Amino acid sequence: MRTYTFDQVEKAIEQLYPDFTINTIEISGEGNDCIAYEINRDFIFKFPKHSRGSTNLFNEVNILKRIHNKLPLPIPEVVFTGMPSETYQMSFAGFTKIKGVPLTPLLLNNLPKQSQNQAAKDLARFLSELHSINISGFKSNLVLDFREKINEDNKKIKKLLSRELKGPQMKKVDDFYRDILENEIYFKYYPCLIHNDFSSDHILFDTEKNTICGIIDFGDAAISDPDNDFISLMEEEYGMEFVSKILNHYKHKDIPTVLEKYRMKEKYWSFEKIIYGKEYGYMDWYEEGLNEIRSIK
């Protein structure tokens, strides 16, 4: 999992964009996939920490380009792109920086009621349009069929914890995965483009106008279940009271299902920690997930 010096970042950009003068550069943030650099306080440059992260970066670029000027809220726009190597699909990507601060649950509840209501309505309107984008042309590398995902994870879990679990413990894993695949509600959704990481950290807020001024980080965006973008808002995120406002402005017809999917995904995070803990090499995630699996059902 690679890192970069400011010297390296400036070199990589100069190679492809010589006339682009860099005056200021600092670490804006860091995720599991990329390190974010704020350059000239105008752009956010994402550099992949590893090969897997570069694929996410490549997909974010692809998705952001085709949904450009189709959404009611400002989203990052691709301005600079890197090159493929034998290690990365995308060496880097430069996006427009969206000004604003994360709409934290604490900031949200300190707002006047009219601003809170407008925030819920703006979020619902954004999701309504996002989930309505024509997803034909989006190739299967952007498609996240949930049933395929569950079945693929199961095979990964078996191959991973084959010698890590005792008899009865692996039986519970079989039971849990069977109960999920047995429930038709998890797979009956109409596939749409989703943000797939729709939380408070990625909802930027303009404190001067008291309005939401951007949605960022589309690195996990894919064609899947629209309910994913509501579940992610109640995980520590927004209270159920505020999400219900969004859901009702969204005209959602089956809230208890969203809550059921919410409970399932909460329990499912244990298995995610095993897979990601071994893929991303997060040995603390692996041991956490392994401890949790060895305990409940």
Ligand X SMILES: NC[C@H]1O[C@H](O[C@H]2[C@H](O)[C@@H](O[C@H]3O[C@H](CO)[C@@H](O)[C@H](N)[C@H]3O)[C@H](N)C[C@@H]2N)[C@H](O)[C@@H](O)[C@@H]1O
Q: Per the structure block, which two tokens stand in for 285? A: 């995630």
Pick between residue 13 and residue 61 the one whose CB is nearest to ligand X. 61
If contact means CB under 5 to 8 A according to the sort of partner, which of ligand X, Cl ion, none does residue 288 touch? none
- Residue 17 or 189: the one with the smaller Cβ distance to Cl ion is 17
Backbone phi, then psi, for 96, in 5-degree steps? Answer: -65, 135
Identify any residues that bridge with 205 across adjacent strands, giving them in sequence order: 101, 212
Sign for the CA dihedral angle at 94, 100, 103, 104 comes to positive
Q: What span, in angstroms and rounded, lies between the C-alpha atoms of 154 and 157?
A: 5
Listed ranges 74-82, 94-102, 166-174, 193-201: which one lies at the site for ligand X (CB under 6 A): 193-201
The reply to whether 46 sits in an annotated binding site is yes
- Contact at 8 Å (CB) between 214 and 74? yes
Binders of ligand X among residues 121 to 150 (CB under 6 A) are: none
Residue 197 is a binding residue for ligand X (CB under 6 A): yes
Interface with ligand X by CB under 6 A: which range of 165-173, 182-190, 197-205, 289-297? Answer: 197-205
Alpha helices in 105-233 (DSSP H): 105-109, 113-130, 146-161, 167-182, 228-231
Mapping DSSP to helix (H, G, I), strand (E, B) and coil, where does residue 224 land?
strand
Q: Least separation, in Å, of the C-beta of 171 and ligand X?
A: 25
- What would the x/- binding string for Cl ion be over residues 19 to 38, using CB under 5 A? x-------------------
Residue partners of 246: CB distance under 8 A and separation at least 6 = 120, 123, 124, 127, 230, 233
- Indicate whether 199 belongs to the interface with ligand X (CB under 6 A): yes
Tell me how far, at minimum, the Cβ of 285 lies from ligand X, in Å. 9
Q: Which residues are annotated as a binding site for ADP?
A: 33-34, 46, 96, 98
Binding stretches for ligand X (CB under 6 A): 31-32, 197, 199, 201, 220, 235, 237, 266, 269, 276
Binding stretches for Cl ion (CB under 5 A): 17, 19
